[PDB]
Ligand binder design. Structure first.
Ligand SMILES: [Cu+2]
Ligand SMILES: [Cu+2]
Ligand SMILES: [Cu+2]
Ligand SMILES: [Cu+2]
Ligand SMILES: [Cu+2]
Ligand SMILES: [Cu+2]
Ligand SMILES: [Cu+2]
Ligand SMILES: [Cu+2]
Ligand SMILES: [Cu+2]
Ligand SMILES: [O]
Ligand SMILES: [O]
Lengths: 270, 269, 269
């Protein structure tokens, strides 16, 4: 039941892109990671510093239509405007009727829904997306969290080779949040590492029958996440991740998960 | 379970379309919802009223090759002809070697397999598809059931790329059956509602580790379903569903889930 | 687990193809099925008989960067050269942080990662792929295992877009390994049969909420498998499998699971 507040700004970036940021002139693509525990409420004091209408739409979380971020529900923001979005989460529980209500926990995301078209096509293309993680009580917390967004044919709207590199040390618990946008399907593959196809990316125990995978088909606005122990059973190294759609990897939709030894070294690569 | 008998008709409809119906003259796209409990048998006395060969093929359910609905197994229907298809369902249970045999329960579908091509490509495109729900003993029943078919670049073969709207009252248990056909992948998204990625779309309880989602990638002939409590924790309103592939949403592959207050109104709509 | 050793060769085949084989002159597409139990180590003495650099990259299994099969990690093989790749597997268990380490068990695959491009595009296109199955202790073993690879618009690089046929007898426990490669998404559908969407393709018991399906969207480098009891509740027959993307099935991406009665015959020929 923690009630939190944050300021968020939409800004046009020096290069032509658009981005969310927690302060003026600090916008990033992807936007800031929002982390909540189930039961939390978040008030987002959103300011649109751009010269076109902009909004904030979230997946997964509970919001009233007045925080939908659409034109249909009159919840976008005029240029230079300001608006307070409210997102809520709940824990799972038993309803009166005896059914189980699923809680909010998961790997989610937020994006623009009015820039360019009513569905936010132009905003999303330009970089108005970011990750949201909602944790369940008792969920295991990572040493670091990284966000990878396959947006059309770019990763994190990077120039290309589109992928960023992420660094860790052997044994670190690392979380990846993976979001996809745009027009195309992709397949996310990471060398050396695997995860479970379930809510957390990790098996609950010997009795969880979830497929264990290292490759997953994803389409626009899919989101999933997982945690790995960096280098577990495989060692230090430059571990690539990439889209496995052969034309995509060949165009350089690839990056590196650099797993260093505890002395800071890595077996030579490239 | 029970042995059930129904009649089904395939008919041309007025725009190059084709549909299945429970009565002559009442063909619809999507076809009629067939709904069964595990164990039941269904005999469908199928009549093809069109001037081309047609069939009925179902996913998921038990059928012998004589009800495959294919030219391969000579189970399609000449123009103006009739054929009785039989679908069977079974409950889950343990085999004599201790392995677990999965039951028929799920969100399935049926479609033509011989119109236009030997894979029913023209029949599907023209509207010859419908939903089938097989329920397990003890499954929670909804108040209303709605079918959304992404068929190539149409929803339920409606023109103007628009999708249908559906109406509920806050708190109604509402079931959606989502089927995809044709050539393209899509991603199904619903504002303000979420479901579990498992058989019923609902978590069994605290031990079920399935991902809770509000967006799912789907391809031709995929089907899944879910139930939601309309407006739960978000309230009344015009809640959009749409394909999230950006050019599909832009082109209007969108509809509304209109969730009313008990007093019949909806926010700013 | 045991330490096992094999030799593997990459070779040019007729018609601009390339394949892996266990012996010189005996390359196949798909390559040989490699089967391991969790805990086993495999040393593959790999010999590149081609005039281009080639490698072996595996999904799912444990390997160090020295056996990555990539240019990045300098672990591919010069023309005429040899290299030992080592693949390891582990059983699941509880870590010291209290979390459960998933084992290596599953349906995996291997393929080239340096022919034509640095992601093996050319090699994969030409036929340098194969299946790997890692079993968990106590996993039920099948009577037969069949591998279907959807590679771009071919099945197992066979001509005329046809897929192979597979034969079984009613009641046989038959395993399928399904791998996808290339540029396209596909949807795998099998008539008459269904499976669970989970690690083994089978439900573990009444507590498993996995969707039971007969159609699954797959993309490049996805792999899954399942076992079915051939003809269970449906009988003998010619049971089609196909991609359900309509233009794919219409182009011939289809094959038959031929299920015989115990007396040897198939219903309808
Ligand atoms: Cu939307
Ligand atoms: Cu891609
Ligand atoms: Cu979205
Ligand atoms: Cu078929
Ligand atoms: Cu779509
Ligand atoms: Cu079908
Ligand atoms: Cu790779
Ligand atoms: Cu296909
Ligand atoms: Cu691969
Ligand atoms: O959205
Ligand atoms: O089919």
């Amino acid at each position: 039941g923690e009630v939190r507040r944050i300021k968020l700004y939409a800004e046009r970036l020096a290069d032509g892109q658009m981005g969310y940021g927690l302060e003026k002139g600090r916008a990033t693509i992807p936007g800031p990671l929002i982390e909540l525990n189930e039961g939390d409420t978040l008030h987002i004091e959103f300011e649109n510093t751009m010269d076109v209408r902009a909004s904030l739409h979230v997946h997964g979380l509970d919001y009233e239509v007045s925080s939908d971020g659409t034109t249909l529900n009159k919840s976008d923001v005029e240029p230079g405007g300001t608006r307070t979005y409210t997102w809520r989460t709940h824990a799972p529980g038993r309803r009166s009727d005896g059914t189980w209500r699923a809680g909010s926990a998961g790997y989610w995301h937020y994006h623009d829904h009015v820039v360019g078209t009513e569905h936010g096509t132009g905003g999303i293309r330009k970089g108005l997306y970011g990750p949201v993680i909602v944790r369940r009580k008792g969920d295991v917390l990572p040493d670091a969290t990284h966000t990878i967004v396959f947006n059309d044919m770019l990763i994190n709207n990077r120039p290309a080779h589109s992928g960023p590199n992420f660094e860790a040390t052997v044994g670190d618990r690392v979380e990846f949040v993976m979001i996809t946008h745009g027009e195309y399907y992709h397949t996310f593959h990471m060398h050396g590492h695997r995860w479970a196809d379930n809510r957390t990316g990790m098996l609950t125990g010997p009795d969880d029958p979830s497929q264990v995978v290292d490759n997953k088909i994803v389409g626009p606005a899919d989101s999933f996440g997982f945690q790995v122990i960096a280098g577990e059973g495989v060692g230090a190294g430059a571990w690539m991740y990439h889209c496995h759609v052969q034309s995509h990897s060949d165009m350089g939709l690839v990056g590196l998960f650099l797993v260093k030894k505890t002395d800071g070294t890595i077996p030579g690569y490239e």
